């Protein structure tokens, strides 16, 4: 699998174990559901760009133990 290291605001090493075949859409929502926040509230940043709902770990250049950031959106949701 692919372990994505998400940088939490409280400095947490969130290790998301994703599957190389599933769209990041299901991963993005699952992250929100786990933290107890609605989707569109947090933006996932990868290489400066933000992961879209139609993005897959196959593109961009995602690898094992990769680093991904998460920040709150200006809208809050």
């Amino acid at each position: 699998y692919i372990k994505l290291k998400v940088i939490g605001q409280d400095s947490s090493e969130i290790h998301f174990k994703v599957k190389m075949t599933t769209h990041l859409k299901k991963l993005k929502e699952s992250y929100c559901q786990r933290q107890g926040v609605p989707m569109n509230s947090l933006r996932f940043l990868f290489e400066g760009q933000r992961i879209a709902d139609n993005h897959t770990p196959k593109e961009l250049g995602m690898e094992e133990e990769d680093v991904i950031e998460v920040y709150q959106e200006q809208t809050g949701g």
Binding site: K3, K5, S12, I14, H15, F16, K17, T22
Partner: peptide
């Protein structure tokens, strides 16, 4: 350390 591994379920 504060690393937590998350495993989800792949479903359409």
């Amino acid at each position: 350390n504060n690393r937590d591994p998350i495993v989800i379920s792949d479903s359409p």
